[PDB]
Amino acid sequence: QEGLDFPEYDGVDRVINVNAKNYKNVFKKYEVLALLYHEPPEDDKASQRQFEMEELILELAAQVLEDKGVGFGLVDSEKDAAVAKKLGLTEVDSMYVFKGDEVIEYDGEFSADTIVEFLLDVLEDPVELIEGERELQAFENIEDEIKLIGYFKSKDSEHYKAFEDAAEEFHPYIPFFATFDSKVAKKLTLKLNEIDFYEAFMEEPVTIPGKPNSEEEIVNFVEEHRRSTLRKLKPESMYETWEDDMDGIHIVAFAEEADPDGFEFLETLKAVAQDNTENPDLSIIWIDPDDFPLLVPYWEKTFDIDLSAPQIGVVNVTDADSVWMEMDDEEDLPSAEELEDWLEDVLEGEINTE
Template sequence: MKWGWVIVGVLLTLGALSWAETGLEIPEYDGKDRVHELTPKNYKSIMKKYDVMVIYYHKHVQGNRAAMKQFQIEELALELAAQVLDDMEDQDIGFALVDEKKGAAVAKKLGLDEVESIYVFADNEIIEYDGELAADTLVEFLYDVIEDPVEIIDNERELKGFYNMDEVIRLVGYFKNFIEYDDAAEEFHPFVKFFATFDAKIAKKLKLKLNEVDFYEPFMEEPVTIPGKPYIEDELVEYIEQHDRPTLRKLEPHSMYEIWEDDIDGEHIVAFAEEDDPGN
């Protein structure tokens, strides 16, 4: 993922950024260095300290004044995200840099293959972050990463929340046991939303039979029931990969580059509208 043209201008003021959805704030930078620089000698010991590791594989900017200035902005975004997440009780999340020239050996060992990309190492998985390099957006994404891959719907409030997520691909199933479903969810976490219920009343409102899974495309009111229940992990993975196709999508900061790369014959049609406009 290329970051060179991204200007995170709001960070230059070091002002407070509000995160409206949760009420959290990105504070002013306190000056403490939390972002590590990985080398062949230290990368193993540093990565062992954390449950989740966020690595920015960046260009070698030494000697290029403009590139160095841009890199300082990007590094500041990482420092602010690290500062916000520093006091988490359940998870230790670390941040680090790998220079494409000085850290080439580390990049090869870790499987980093695209310069100017952010990689998240969590639960023996490597996740490439396809969003804006801004502290608030990155923090929001990392909260999604550490959540369970399957969200359980237990009540009417949670069911309403599920229906309100019409802008994303999501699946929902009704189970007594969902091991295969959970394993499939881990393959796509956190990019595809998986939901499940064990409640017969909730399942009835979702029009689900036992061991059945419905697949919702973005902005489509009616789902498609995945054929072949009861499912095994490979069947679910194959179905999602076949149906994760370019459709109407909402451009959001945490996934905008992924959507932008998902073109049809090199073309996009982009509509600009007010989110709360009932005519859109």
């Protein structure tokens, strides 16, 4: 209770419809503005209470973040079509966050805490500094996300400023790090103004060519290397990741990292992904079921799998049709060779959902 009191919605109306009349003043009122771009709801009671539930979630987030200068609004895809075209709102059910000169699309779990955590991340500065051996270890501990790190003279360096400009383009989904510490740069093998790109779960980085790097060179490189061989599904971006597949067919690996059997399978998956990381056609989404408890019974019934054991399979996003690697039980995990056999069969189409 005292010192540990979750906020409860006070009923004050803070999330309003944004339209051609007020959108210019609403932007002036709030330093950071989050606009949910939505289609008009249907009269169905299941979709009626659904839409009212969404706005109340934004109402709680608006209350929690009021003092930090964050505002929330709603934009109707039909009623406010001219406003949506002017602002760049194009994907229904996405929430567009306006910070400075940037527009950030939120396409993640629509819950109050996930949205507030995301907005708190948006409020942070886009570049994290690294100085000393212990901060370097914190950088090295990052593995489940893409990361960049550059070595510059100081914050006054023109090349640091270009690095920060590029960081703003991907904020807050890709952490950018900068060091002015020559001893840190030496251990990372970074020469002056060099920037290293670390693919998720990869040990070895890729150095951005053509140093020093303009904002344009960094942004183009990151866009070219956007898709990791192994990606971890995260609530803040779960629908963006789920929708980011060419043929709507995912290789999905379920592994509970804290469980001994899940850990064993995760080791093999990471090693295979590392050994095959140059394959431009291989991409695997790792889901830790402990990150999505409300989806665990849904997954087990829809996929006909037991999520207390590791799994890897093929999922068709059209109708959740799926096929899974055969294991006798949790102790019959594939070797790296067996896993590589199975992935090659999936890429060739020999193993499929159809």
